[PDB]
Amino acid sequence: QWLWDIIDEFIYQFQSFSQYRCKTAKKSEEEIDFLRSNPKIWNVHSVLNVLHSLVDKSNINRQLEVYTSGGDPESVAGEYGRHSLYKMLGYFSLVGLLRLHSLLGDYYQAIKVLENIELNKKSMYSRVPECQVTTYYYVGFAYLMMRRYQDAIRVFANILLYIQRTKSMFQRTTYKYEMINKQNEQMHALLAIALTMYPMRIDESIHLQLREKYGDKMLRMQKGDPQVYEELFSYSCPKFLSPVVPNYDSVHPNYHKEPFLQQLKVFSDEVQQQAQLSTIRSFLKLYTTMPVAKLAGFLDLTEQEFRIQLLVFKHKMKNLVWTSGISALDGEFQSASEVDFYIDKDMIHIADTKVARRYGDFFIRQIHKFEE
Amino acid sequence: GGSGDSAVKQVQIDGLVVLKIIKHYQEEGQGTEVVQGVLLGLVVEDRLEITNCFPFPQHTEDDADFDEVQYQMEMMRSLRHVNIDHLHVGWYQSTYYGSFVTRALLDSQFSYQHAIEESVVLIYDPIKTAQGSLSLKAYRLTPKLMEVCKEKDFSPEALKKANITFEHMFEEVPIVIKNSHLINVLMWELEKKSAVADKHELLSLASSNHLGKNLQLLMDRVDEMSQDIVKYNTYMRNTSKQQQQKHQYQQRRQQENMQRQSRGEPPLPEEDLSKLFKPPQPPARMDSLLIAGQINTYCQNIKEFTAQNLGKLFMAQALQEYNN
Amino acid sequence: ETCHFQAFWQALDENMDLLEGITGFEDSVRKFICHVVGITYQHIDRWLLAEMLGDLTDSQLKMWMSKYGWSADESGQIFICSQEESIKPKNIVEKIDFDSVSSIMAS
Amino acid sequence: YLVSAMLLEIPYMAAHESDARRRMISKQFHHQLRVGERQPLLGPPESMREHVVAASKAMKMGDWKTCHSFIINEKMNGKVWDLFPEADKVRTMLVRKIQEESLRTYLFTYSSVYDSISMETLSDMFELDLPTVHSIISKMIINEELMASLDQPTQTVVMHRTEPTAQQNLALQLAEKLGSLVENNERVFDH
Amino acid sequence: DLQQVGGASARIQDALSTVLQYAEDVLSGKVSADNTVGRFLMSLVNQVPKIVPDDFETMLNSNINDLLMVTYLANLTQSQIALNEKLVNL
């Protein structure tokens, strides 16, 4: 009862404020102007937007994942709760992007994604690191869903770096500080499995404490064990969807695991054959143009007799991960071995290091201010 | 008003001064820092103007030893008789290894600045820093330290004057941007000694060619800076180590001994309890690194910023020149 | 998705009139077969390209031959793409980032 | 004692001054060599200390030749040689070790200069044989962690390990890296 | 200032080499660069730049990649000159 005394009092206070949101932003200049003046912080005004991003999503996820029939939650929020706030004229501040990226978050859990196009187009206001890191969060996830593994893996690198010149300080990632650490860790780990004999960019993204364990995971996954298919997929699911609260686990109510059938089994199909793409590339491409010695050496390696070695070989070159040609008279297999790049880290660091100098020189000149 | 703090203006160093500096250029004090002369000048429009120097020599055999001031007194009369007066408003040591303001140079300066507050201290840096940037380094001493005057002792007034927190990244004045008005004659010589007797002009200019080609300039800079700077870095680290151990690591053990006493014995002392903390020499903030050492962090960043720059220029010129 | 085009046309049941009832569907999948052929073949055999498109005849294959400008080669494959035109490496070439790096290191 | 340590430490310091230095240990033969090293005035050795210093300098230069000086002459002076019937054995034991570790001291410096090596030369020059020089160079490139690629059937090494500027760069990289590490102690003390 | 009067020399050179070419272009001339400046310029291109393979260009690049890595390491050391100076002040 204490459970749904808290839950219901969030939504009823948000439904209250939703009317104030629509009322102030659009037309009442003097009410906005009166609100600019009185406090020393306009931070109180702005926080309440994306504070209610993740708290409302929790409360609606509970009501979603308790009532699976005669749907009250999902059409009320979708119609009224979300579109009224966002579709109409933005408040003049970062609040226009806050309500945008609150809506982008709400739009993310729903698996209907195609208006990521126009959400970026309506992000007219400048990309502050606060708004930008949370844009690249979802935009990278959108590329992860687009099967643009090579694009998305770069986008996850920067947001996990912790020299995007974040400083926070006053609770703008609060109570989920390490979610940004572990979700970017996790979703980057899936992308490494698909392609990698290219980056050589994983050094920047993830630190060696985790690179060591996730490194051996990919190898153990693709080569010799489907065990990593399990444990990777266990950690990947809470982070792929982001279901903010799983409901109280008990057998007396059912009500909760039924949505989790869909939610989970939706992502089963993702990692299923995308993982089995990996093992083909896993065997290093030892000799770039393969004669009879190496082509048969690789067709001994693909699968054994008899039936249907060549067919399966020529099915898998198509996907994205080989570029090659067949010759008839020679009987020769000629192929493409492409590689990435060595050092791209140093020249990106040359400014980052100078920020270690800068905020060094600056913070002590704030202490040199005080004790002088 | 670009004028300095609370007794003085900027400095202007007339060209005939710097000619007389590069006469005792970098010898008579190569590997030894020797005060090569006093800067004699006068208060001019928004600046001092050092119009003449006379050099101060010393017993430079291979070590420097201070001599009778019979030199300086007779030579400052020698100036006074044909020219102005003894008007020593600074001094110049060139001398040894691209611009560096040593603790000794800070102490000699402190005696100089408190005595006559119309002063700067020059550090004339020629080709040795790979020339390079900030050839004339001026620097006067903060009037804060001339108000918390002597002395920064190891425990009292190291900590206390560290807590006052006077500058040690303190401002350095610009030196030239203007007509000195003794441009005059040396202007007239330019037309003579260019074109129709450009022997000695071209001789000086083609010095550049061999500043590039031959033996290990930037290499030797970065080599000497690989040794000079790692010395200083290691020193702060082991200085900081021992002091931070007296600050916390010793408090850690003795307060865990204060546990055992139970912090009070009613019938009689509390000898043990009293004789916990009995002073080691740093209680906090060893000052002479924090001030004077940090003036050389600034100078070491400067040497690095200098040695970098001429490198940056080549990295443009090299690529580009061959690109045609 | 796994690009088993041989198995695709085998797998088809021909009694499901709905799959006949989608207009241009039978050619669309063929156009996607030939689309990925261009990306990852330099040549393909005449019998091979036939079989991937559902065991085409000599005359049926004339459409697909003409579609992307493909034409016969000596003994006896169908040309798809030039060897250097297919591969497109964008590998090792950087460290030419001088201009930006000196613009930021300018002061 | 001073000769036992010699074969251990002269490759060790050859390695160190090729910038493998952090393993430099005082109060050892390092010190006992140091006190004799810092003579401005040594010409021919006439003390057993000085004969050790003499053979030490020869080992640094990496010439076998300089080992033999002290092993013959000072051992007759000195009758270090003449107290064992097994000096005959211990000769051979000293000699081949000198020839192997002098090769190693030579290699610790010279390997920047190389592009490749006739491994046959090394056998001929340091008076060793190919089976052993295989096993030596094999052990070396495994455990001294060199950037050599070693063709053992062809009797060839292909190395190409740079850079002379590295001696400065790795040194300031260390001077740098030493910063953060002591600094974390200054943190952990403070808190 | 030595840099931007650098290419100025090459620009006033472009002026003069034009006039020495143009002497021949109008009527006749260029004795003036037949084997006087013709020998100066062969020497000039034997100095700056060097000879022209592409092995040169890659070695020149590798030298800049080294110089830049050293100039970079000078800013890395400025950063650590800062960081130890800072914790002591804290």
Side-chain angles (χ1 to χ4, degrees):
Chain A
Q1 60 182 6
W2 183 84
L3 185 55
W4 291 90
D5 186 59
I6 294 170
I7 299 158
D8 195 61
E9 193 174 1
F10 276 127
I11 303 173
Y12 189 66
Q13 188 174 356
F14 298 159
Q15 289 292 103
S16 292
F17 294 167
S18 294
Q19 303 179 2
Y20 285 99
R21 294 292 182 194
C22 295
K23 182 171 65 178
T24 51
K26 298 203 301 292
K27 187 175 180 179
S28 51
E29 300 181 1
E30 289 70 57
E31 193 171 2
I32 299 172
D33 192 59
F34 190 65
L35 194 61
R36 294 173 183 131
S37 52
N38 300 306
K40 297 184 177 63
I41 42 178
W42 55 283
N43 300 113
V44 182
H45 311 151
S46 295
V47 162
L48 296 168
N49 291 279
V50 168
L51 185 64
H52 303 172
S53 186
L54 192 64
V55 176
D56 200 8
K57 177 175 288 301
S58 194
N59 304 130
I60 296 295
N61 193 42
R62 293 188 185 96
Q63 293 183 337
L64 186 64
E65 298 179 353
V66 165
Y67 293 109
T68 60
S69 53
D72 305 300
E74 199 170 13
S75 294
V76 171
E79 297 178 0
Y80 181 65
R82 270 55 174 169
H83 298 175
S84 298
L85 302 181
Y86 176 55
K87 194 174 184 297
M88 303 191 291
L89 187 59
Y91 182 98
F92 308 121
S93 196
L94 281 64
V95 177
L97 293 185
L98 293 169
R99 295 198 295 180
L100 192 149
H101 298 307
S102 186
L103 187 275
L104 182 56
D106 298 317
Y107 194 57
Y108 184 63
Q109 191 178 24
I111 328 182
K112 197 290 184 179
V113 277
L114 181 56
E115 302 182 356
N116 306 114
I117 303 173
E118 188 173 355
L119 294 169
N120 294 342
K121 190 179 178 181
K122 293 176 68 180
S123 294
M124 300 180 288
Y125 189 73
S126 192
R127 298 183 298 177
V128 182
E130 303 174 3
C131 301
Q132 192 170 11
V133 169
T134 59
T135 294
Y136 285 132
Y137 204 63
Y138 297 117
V139 168
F141 301 151
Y143 295 147
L144 158 68
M145 290 164 173
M146 196 179 174
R147 300 186 295 167
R148 293 302 304 156
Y149 313 94
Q150 199 177 5
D151 295 358
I153 196 169
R154 299 189 296 247
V155 174
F156 294 156
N158 302 303
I159 56 179
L160 187 49
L161 186 62
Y162 198 70
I163 315 178
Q164 298 298 289
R165 294 78 183 241
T166 53
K167 190 178 186 180
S168 304
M169 197 174 290
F170 199 67
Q171 57 177 359
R172 299 189 295 271
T173 52
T174 190
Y175 310 121
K176 286 299 188 179
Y177 184 64
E178 301 185 0
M179 189 176 70
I180 310 177
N181 190 8
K182 190 176 170 61
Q183 186 151 313
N184 294 335
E185 173 193 299
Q186 188 59 49
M187 296 291 98
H188 185 285
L190 180 56
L191 298 178
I193 295 164
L195 295 184
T196 298
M197 54 168 57
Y198 295 96
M200 306 176 182
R201 298 189 297 268
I202 306 181
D203 298 297
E204 301 89 81
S205 59
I206 296 179
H207 311 298
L208 186 54
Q209 184 179 1
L210 294 163
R211 292 198 307 261
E212 189 173 359
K213 185 175 293 300
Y214 279 104
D216 196 58
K217 272 176 175 295
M218 174 183 75
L219 302 172
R220 192 169 71 257
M221 188 149 165
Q222 65 194 333
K223 300 179 67 181
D225 292 295
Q227 184 180 0
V228 194
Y229 187 74
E230 188 178 2
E231 188 177 358
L232 193 81
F233 193 63
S234 70
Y235 299 153
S236 290
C237 291
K239 298 301 188 298
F240 206 104
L241 184 62
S242 192
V244 182
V245 55
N247 289 261
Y248 182 59
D249 298 300
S250 185
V251 186
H252 305 295
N254 186 0
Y255 301 164
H256 315 308
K257 190 172 290 183
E258 302 180 354
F260 283 128
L261 299 175
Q262 181 68 355
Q263 293 172 14
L264 298 169
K265 294 175 184 179
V266 161
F267 302 143
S268 191
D269 302 302
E270 300 286 357
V271 189
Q272 188 174 4
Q273 300 185 312
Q274 295 179 17
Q276 200 170 9
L277 188 63
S278 307
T279 316
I280 316 166
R281 183 274 306 144
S282 188
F283 178 67
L284 300 172
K285 300 178 186 183
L286 304 182
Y287 203 54
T288 59
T289 291
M290 294 186 175
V292 186
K294 294 292 162 296
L295 176 58
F298 186 53
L299 286 163
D300 190 53
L301 198 144
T302 300
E303 58 182 3
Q304 204 54 246
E305 62 180 2
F306 188 72
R307 196 176 290 105
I308 43 166
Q309 303 181 356
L310 298 173
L311 286 67
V312 175
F313 176 54
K314 292 174 181 181
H315 298 326
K316 286 170 168 179
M317 291 187 293
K318 299 290 94 190
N319 304 126
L320 196 61
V321 294
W322 296 85
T323 301
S324 55
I326 313 300
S327 187
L329 291 169
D330 300 301
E332 184 178 0
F333 178 59
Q334 304 183 0
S335 199
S337 293
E338 291 90 352
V339 291
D340 193 54
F341 180 43
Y342 191 21
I343 300 166
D344 55 3
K345 68 176 68 60
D346 288 350
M347 301 296 100
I348 300 176
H349 292 316
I350 202 154
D352 295 346
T353 195
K354 194 174 182 179
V355 173
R357 179 167 169 78
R358 183 60 179 177
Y359 185 43
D361 296 352
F362 185 69
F363 189 83
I364 266 299
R365 289 175 187 154
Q366 300 301 108
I367 299 297
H368 187 72
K369 185 70 173 182
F370 304 150
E371 61 174 355
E372 180 178 297
Chain B
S3 300
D5 300 300
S6 202
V8 69
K9 304 181 170 61
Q10 307 173 307
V11 66
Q12 172 63 59
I13 302 173
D14 185 55
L16 289 58
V17 185
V18 195
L19 288 165
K20 292 181 175 184
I21 301 177
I22 315 157
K23 199 269 165 177
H24 305 103
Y25 41 100
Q26 194 50 64
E27 289 294 298
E28 306 173 358
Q30 174 59 267
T32 303
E33 295 184 354
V34 175
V35 182
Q36 294 184 349
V38 278
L39 295 168
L40 282 70
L42 54 145
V43 184
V44 300
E45 187 178 1
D46 202 61
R47 304 191 173 264
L48 297 168
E49 190 173 355
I50 316 307
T51 49
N52 206 5
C53 57
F54 62 87
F56 187 71
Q58 295 183 8
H59 302 96
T60 306
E61 180 61 63
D62 193 54
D63 294 296
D65 298 295
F66 197 70
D67 192 31
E68 305 297 299
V69 199
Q70 296 296 300
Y71 181 82
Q72 192 176 6
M73 294 296 169
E74 193 60 65
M75 187 54 113
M76 69 79 180
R77 286 185 292 266
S78 296
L79 188 65
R80 182 182 297 175
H81 293 305
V82 287
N83 304 138
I84 317 181
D85 181 54
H86 188 34
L87 296 171
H88 60 134
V89 286
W91 45 280
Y92 61 100
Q93 63 92 52
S94 289
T95 287
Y96 185 58
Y97 185 52
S99 304
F100 196 80
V101 179
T102 323
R103 298 181 289 271
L105 304 178
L106 194 65
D107 289 351
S108 296
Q109 178 172 19
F110 185 29
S111 191
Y112 198 97
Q113 288 276 163
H114 193 224
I116 306 177
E117 299 181 358
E118 293 73 59
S119 184
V120 287
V121 178
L122 184 60
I123 298 187
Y124 176 62
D125 187 1
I127 59 176
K128 65 184 177 62
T129 197
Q131 196 178 314
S133 298
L134 197 62
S135 297
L136 292 163
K137 172 183 282 293
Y139 176 62
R140 62 85 57 100
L141 181 59
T142 320
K144 297 185 175 185
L145 187 53
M146 302 194 289
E147 187 177 2
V148 293
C149 202
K150 302 180 181 180
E151 214 281 298
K152 298 171 274 73
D153 192 60
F154 196 93
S155 183
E157 304 304 300
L159 182 50
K160 185 61 178 180
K161 295 180 181 176
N163 295 341
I164 292 172
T165 326
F166 68 102
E167 289 69 77
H168 44 265
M169 305 301 284
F170 184 81
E171 188 177 0
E172 294 182 352
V173 294
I175 298 178
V176 57
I177 187 60
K178 65 176 197 183
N179 191 350
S180 56
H181 303 290
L182 197 45
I183 299 303
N184 301 316
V185 190
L186 302 177
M187 184 58 163
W188 188 46
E189 300 301 299
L190 179 50
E191 61 85 16
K192 303 189 184 299
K193 303 298 176 68
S194 191
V196 297
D198 56 8
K199 291 76 173 179
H200 319 300
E201 186 171 293
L202 302 177
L203 186 49
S204 303
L205 283 165
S207 301
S208 298
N209 296 303
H210 308 89
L211 197 61
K213 195 175 72 175
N214 300 299
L215 294 172
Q216 56 180 356
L217 182 57
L218 185 54
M219 184 175 183
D220 189 59
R221 292 287 78 204
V222 173
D223 194 63
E224 293 188 14
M225 288 153 47
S226 295
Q227 186 177 8
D228 193 72
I229 303 182
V230 70
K231 285 160 57 182
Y232 181 72
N233 293 352
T234 299
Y235 195 73
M236 296 192 84
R237 286 183 301 227
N238 289 301
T239 297
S240 190
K241 188 173 182 179
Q242 296 179 0
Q243 72 179 305
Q244 287 295 122
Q245 286 173 359
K246 301 306 188 180
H247 301 166
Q248 290 285 107
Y249 194 51
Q250 289 297 110
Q251 302 295 131
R252 193 174 298 179
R253 295 177 177 185
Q254 74 190 359
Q255 187 61 46
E256 198 174 0
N257 196 75
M258 201 172 292
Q259 183 185 359
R260 312 300 295 181
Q261 300 302 120
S262 200
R263 203 171 178 173
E265 299 181 5
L268 288 171
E270 311 182 11
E271 297 184 0
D272 298 301
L273 191 67
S274 291
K275 293 164 188 176
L276 302 164
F277 195 63
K278 283 285 165 291
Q281 302 185 2
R285 300 294 186 86
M286 290 173 53
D287 197 53
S288 194
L289 295 180
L290 215 78
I291 302 300
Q294 295 190 6
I295 293 168
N296 290 300
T297 63
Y298 189 44
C299 295
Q300 286 168 353
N301 294 319
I302 287 169
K303 285 178 289 187
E304 289 173 354
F305 195 63
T306 292
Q308 283 168 34
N309 284 348
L310 192 64
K312 303 177 198 178
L313 303 191
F314 185 64
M315 293 188 290
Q317 286 281 4
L319 184 61
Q320 293 169 19
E321 192 75 1
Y322 181 70
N323 200 240
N324 185 74
Chain C
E1 186 177 3
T2 56
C3 300
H4 291 47
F5 303 138
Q6 288 86 354
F8 179 77
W9 300 106
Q10 188 177 5
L12 182 60
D13 299 298
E14 300 177 359
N15 299 109
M16 185 177 287
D17 301 297
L18 188 60
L19 307 176
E20 186 180 0
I22 312 306
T23 305
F25 175 68
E26 303 182 1
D27 296 295
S28 282
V29 178
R30 291 183 180 115
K31 292 170 69 177
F32 166 59
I33 290 164
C34 294
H35 179 62
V36 177
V37 163
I39 302 169
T40 56
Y41 272 148
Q42 298 168 356
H43 301 282
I44 194 174
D45 192 60
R46 193 172 187 86
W47 184 259
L48 185 53
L49 183 58
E51 187 181 355
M52 289 182 173
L53 300 167
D55 199 4
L56 300 179
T57 62
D58 191 72
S59 190
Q60 289 173 357
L61 192 60
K62 292 183 171 64
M63 301 182 181
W64 304 97
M65 186 178 179
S66 297
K67 186 167 291 301
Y68 292 119
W70 299 335
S71 193
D73 189 58
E74 182 180 359
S75 302
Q77 296 184 290
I78 294 176
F79 176 80
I80 296 298
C81 194
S82 189
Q83 306 190 350
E84 58 185 1
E85 185 59 59
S86 56
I87 55 177
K88 296 179 170 175
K90 287 84 62 177
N91 299 350
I92 295 164
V93 296
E94 298 181 357
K95 285 294 188 181
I96 55 176
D97 305 296
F98 177 65
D99 299 299
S100 189
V101 171
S102 59
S103 294
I104 61 179
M105 291 164 61
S107 296
Chain D
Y1 171 68
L2 302 173
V3 171
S4 294
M6 195 165 67
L7 291 162
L8 298 170
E9 292 185 4
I10 298 182
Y12 200 40
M13 68 188 67
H16 298 332
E17 300 305 293
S18 195
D19 301 286
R21 50 188 177 188
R22 63 285 175 89
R23 306 175 295 174
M24 190 69 72
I25 292 164
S26 300
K27 300 183 293 300
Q28 207 178 3
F29 178 55
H30 295 92
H31 182 58
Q32 280 76 271
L33 181 59
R34 188 180 69 168
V35 295
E37 189 62 54
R38 293 171 69 173
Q39 291 178 10
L41 283 163
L42 186 54
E46 301 293 307
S47 188
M48 306 295 127
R49 300 184 180 183
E50 298 177 357
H51 307 319
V52 172
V53 174
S56 188
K57 290 174 177 178
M59 192 62 177
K60 287 184 289 185
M61 294 189 288
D63 192 8
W64 54 286
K65 305 175 183 177
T66 305
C67 308
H68 300 324
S69 301
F70 312 113
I71 290 174
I72 296 168
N73 300 116
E74 303 302 297
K75 299 302 96 178
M76 287 188 298
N77 300 125
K79 304 190 174 185
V80 165
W81 182 278
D82 296 294
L83 303 174
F84 302 119
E86 291 189 1
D88 301 298
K89 306 180 183 177
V90 173
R91 185 276 313 281
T92 312
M93 298 168 176
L94 281 165
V95 159
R96 294 285 179 269
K97 289 290 97 183
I98 289 161
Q99 291 173 352
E100 287 174 57
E101 300 308 291
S102 64
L103 167 141
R104 207 183 299 270
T105 59
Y106 160 57
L107 292 163
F108 283 132
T109 301
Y110 200 65
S111 288
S112 298
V113 194
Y114 284 137
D115 283 358
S116 300
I117 329 176
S118 281
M119 292 171 58
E120 302 176 357
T121 301
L122 301 173
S123 302
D124 295 351
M125 186 163 68
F126 291 96
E127 199 181 1
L128 297 170
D129 56 292
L130 286 157
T132 312
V133 168
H134 289 304
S135 186
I136 294 157
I137 295 176
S138 297
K139 287 167 182 175
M140 183 180 65
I141 299 168
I142 298 280
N143 292 295
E144 307 303 305
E145 303 180 359
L146 301 180
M147 299 300 179
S149 297
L150 179 61
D151 205 320
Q152 302 178 48
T154 306
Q155 303 175 358
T156 284
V157 203
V158 170
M159 301 182 62
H160 304 286
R161 53 203 305 269
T162 57
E163 182 71 50
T165 66
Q167 301 177 12
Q168 302 178 18
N169 296 344
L170 296 169
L172 276 169
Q173 191 173 299
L174 182 58
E176 195 286 308
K177 189 182 187 178
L178 288 168
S180 188
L181 292 168
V182 187
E183 195 176 359
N184 285 305
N185 303 319
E186 311 317 304
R187 291 175 183 114
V188 166
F189 296 140
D190 193 58
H191 296 83
Chain E
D1 296 312
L2 194 62
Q3 185 181 29
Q4 296 180 0
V5 179
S9 302
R11 185 182 67 232
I12 308 167
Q13 186 180 57
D14 202 78
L16 182 58
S17 190
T18 294
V19 168
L20 297 169
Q21 288 171 8
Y22 193 58
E24 191 181 11
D25 296 349
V26 174
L27 181 61
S28 193
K30 198 184 181 297
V31 181
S32 311
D34 190 1
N35 205 14
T36 45
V37 182
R39 288 174 72 159
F40 298 157
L41 283 167
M42 288 294 291
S43 192
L44 179 65
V45 176
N46 298 338
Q47 289 175 5
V48 47
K50 215 181 178 179
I51 62 175
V52 58
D54 293 347
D55 303 295
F56 190 72
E57 184 176 1
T58 305
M59 186 179 74
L60 194 278
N61 291 345
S62 296
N63 190 240
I64 298 315
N65 295 328
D66 192 4
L67 289 168
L68 190 51
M69 190 66 195
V70 175
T71 304
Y72 174 47
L73 179 61
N75 292 298
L76 297 177
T77 50
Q78 286 185 356
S79 302
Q80 195 62 54
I81 286 168
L83 291 154
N84 295 118
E85 183 187 358
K86 264 59 200 180
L87 190 58
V88 69
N89 288 338
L90 293 169

